[PDB]
Design an enzyme around this catalytic site. Structure first.
Site, PDB file in Angstrom:
ATOM      1  N   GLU A 119     140.449  37.984  67.813  1.00  0.00           N
ATOM      2  CA  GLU A 119     141.856  38.258  67.409  1.00  0.00           C
ATOM      3  C   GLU A 119     142.841  38.216  68.603  1.00  0.00           C
ATOM      4  O   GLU A 119     143.888  38.854  68.575  1.00  0.00           O
ATOM      5  CB  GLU A 119     141.951  39.612  66.694  1.00  0.00           C
ATOM      6  CG  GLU A 119     141.385  39.516  65.275  1.00  0.00           C
ATOM      7  CD  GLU A 119     141.374  40.826  64.539  1.00  0.00           C
ATOM      8  OE1 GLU A 119     140.679  41.734  64.999  1.00  0.00           O
ATOM      9  OE2 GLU A 119     142.049  40.955  63.479  1.00  0.00           O
ATOM     10  N   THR A 124     145.906  30.756  66.359  1.00  0.00           N
ATOM     11  CA  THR A 124     147.351  30.658  66.113  1.00  0.00           C
ATOM     12  C   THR A 124     147.971  29.639  67.043  1.00  0.00           C
ATOM     13  O   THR A 124     148.861  28.906  66.654  1.00  0.00           O
ATOM     14  CB  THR A 124     147.962  32.028  66.258  1.00  0.00           C
ATOM     15  OG1 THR A 124     147.278  32.921  65.383  1.00  0.00           O
ATOM     16  CG2 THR A 124     149.458  32.058  65.897  1.00  0.00           C
ATOM     17  N   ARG A 130     145.230  35.512  59.023  1.00  0.00           N
ATOM     18  CA  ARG A 130     144.090  35.949  59.830  1.00  0.00           C
ATOM     19  C   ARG A 130     142.815  35.577  59.101  1.00  0.00           C
ATOM     20  O   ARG A 130     142.516  36.124  58.010  1.00  0.00           O
ATOM     21  CB  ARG A 130     144.149  37.426  60.058  1.00  0.00           C
ATOM     22  CG  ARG A 130     143.173  37.944  61.106  1.00  0.00           C
ATOM     23  CD  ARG A 130     141.887  38.398  60.560  1.00  0.00           C
ATOM     24  NE  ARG A 130     140.949  38.437  61.675  1.00  0.00           N
ATOM     25  CZ  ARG A 130     139.758  39.027  61.635  1.00  0.00           C
ATOM     26  NH1 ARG A 130     139.356  39.607  60.512  1.00  0.00           N
ATOM     27  NH2 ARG A 130     138.970  39.018  62.716  1.00  0.00           N
ATOM     28  N   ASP A 187     138.667  25.187  69.701  1.00  0.00           N
ATOM     29  CA  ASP A 187     138.883  26.581  69.330  1.00  0.00           C
ATOM     30  C   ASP A 187     137.530  27.133  68.860  1.00  0.00           C
ATOM     31  O   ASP A 187     136.806  26.436  68.153  1.00  0.00           O
ATOM     32  CB  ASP A 187     139.943  26.625  68.201  1.00  0.00           C
ATOM     33  CG  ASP A 187     140.264  28.054  67.736  1.00  0.00           C
ATOM     34  OD1 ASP A 187     140.095  29.013  68.514  1.00  0.00           O
ATOM     35  OD2 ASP A 187     140.714  28.176  66.589  1.00  0.00           O
ATOM     36  N   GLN A 189     134.705  36.876  68.605  1.00  0.00           N
ATOM     37  CA  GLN A 189     133.940  38.091  68.372  1.00  0.00           C
ATOM     38  C   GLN A 189     132.498  37.914  68.959  1.00  0.00           C
ATOM     39  O   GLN A 189     132.074  36.807  69.256  1.00  0.00           O
ATOM     40  CB  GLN A 189     133.879  38.450  66.867  1.00  0.00           C
ATOM     41  CG  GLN A 189     135.210  39.053  66.387  1.00  0.00           C
ATOM     42  CD  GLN A 189     135.106  39.736  65.067  1.00  0.00           C
ATOM     43  OE1 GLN A 189     134.053  39.689  64.396  1.00  0.00           O
ATOM     44  NE2 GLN A 189     136.206  40.371  64.660  1.00  0.00           N
TER      45      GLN A 189
END
Ligand SMILES: Nc1nc2c(ncn2[C@@H]2O[C@H](COP(=O)(O)OP(=O)(O)OP(O)(O)=S)[C@@H](O)[C@H]2O)c(=O)[nH]1
Ligand SMILES: O=S([O-])[O-]
Ligand SMILES: [Mg+2]
Length: 320
Positions: free
Chosen positions: A12, A17, A147, A169, A173
């Site tokens: 995150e 984005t 998200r 990309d 996590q």
């Protein structure tokens, strides 16, 4: 000629984005059909955010401000299944709107560091009337604000300043870290993303670990890996909009107990920059190119990515 950019950073932090902004800035945006594909992601994100706050009220023992909301919370679950399939009735929107306005829900919302809540929760929940319209079509910002955890490797291509960019990309996590090495060949530059606002949060994966400490460990590993000695290291200190608001009210000493600055943006942002840049073990031979970003803000990313590109053109693309 070709430029390979690899986005790295913890969960995150904003990597995906930035990928979306490249489509908006360099490839004329998301089309109506592409936008409609995100409609169920917007509704899912909205529903999951209000459900997360309602779950937390049970854990933290927070009452609804108005008892009438107990029946709205019952109806939330009866009606929620539709949003998950891309439908948002006026009735479901009414229920979510009354929940979101309740003072006990707001008290819980303002304690979200105590649980896990999507950063776009307030964005969507404050815009319910707009996203519940008949024939709603997500806007570019609505798409940027979605998200979804990245669980593979995503490759996108675009052209800019006569260069052919290939941008990669990957998920950040802990479950996805093992995959980073599949992207390590032929990298022109790493864009390492840090969520500035994560300093008082804990990992979704592990509630004992501070999110910014995790980000530091990952940056120390990447910046100092000698495999990347001649790969440019770009550091995006991202979520500067959320950080500006949070630093007013949540002490940076949660993360850095020696911080002696004020609860203000410029001092605290510089302090965090210095904590990450200090991790560079080879300060005279390895440069870090640091930018402060708001990845959801197209104008900011456009000017920052223009500046970044100019540096890559100068440093990595000479023709011998
Ligand atoms: N307000 C604000 N929101 C942001 C910013 N950057 C990202 N977001 C939002 O945060 C959420 C997570 O961003 P995302 O791009 O998914 O992270 P990621 O790094 O790709 O995450 P992962 O795939 O490793 S789990 C999204 O809802 C996105 O819209 C920012 O600078 N400001
Ligand atoms: O990231 S671990 O699974 O090697
Ligand atoms: Mg992602």
């Amino acid at each position: 000629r070709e430029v390979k950019l690899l986005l790295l950073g913890a969960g995150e932090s904003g990597k995906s984005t930035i990928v979306k902004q490249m489509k908006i800035i360099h490839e004329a945006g998301y089309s109506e059909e592409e936008c409609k594909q995100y409609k169920a992601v917007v509704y899912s994100n909205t529903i999951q955010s209000i459900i997360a706050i309602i779950r937390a009220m049970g854990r933290l023992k927070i009452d609804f401000g108005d008892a009438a909301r107990a029946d709205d919370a019952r109806q939330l679950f009866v009606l929620a299944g539709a949003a998950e399939e891309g439908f948002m009735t006026a009735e479901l929107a009414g229920v979510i709107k009354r929940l979101w306005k309740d003072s006990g829900v707001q008290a819980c919302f303002n304690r979200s560091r105590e649980y896990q809540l999507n950063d776009s929760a307030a964005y969507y929940l404050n815009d319910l009337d707009r996203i519940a319209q008949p024939n709603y079509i997500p806007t570019q910002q609505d798409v940027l604000r979605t998200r979804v955890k990245t669980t593979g490797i995503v490759e996108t291509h675009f052209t800019f300043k006569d260069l052919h960019f290939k941008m990669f990309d990957v998920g950040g996590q802990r479950s996805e870290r093992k995959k980073w090495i599949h992207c390590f060949e032929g990298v022109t530059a790493i864009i390492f993303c840090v969520a500035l606002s994560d300093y008082d949060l804990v990992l979704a994966e592990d509630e004992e670990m501070n999110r910014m400490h995790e980000s530091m460990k990952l940056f120390d590993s990447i910046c100092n890996n000698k495999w990347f000695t001649d790969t440019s290291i770009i550091l995006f200190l991202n979520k500067k909009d959320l950080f500006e608001e949070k630093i007013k009210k949540s002490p940076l000493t949660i993360c850095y107990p020696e911080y002696a600055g004020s609860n203000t943006y410029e001092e605290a942002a510089a302090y965090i920059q210095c904590q990450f840049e200090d991790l560079n073990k080879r300060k005279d031979t390895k440069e870090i190119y640091t930018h402060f970003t708001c990845a959801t803000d197209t104008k900011n990313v456009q000017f920052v990515f223009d500046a970044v590109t100019d540096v890559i053109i100068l440093n990595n693309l000479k023709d011998c």
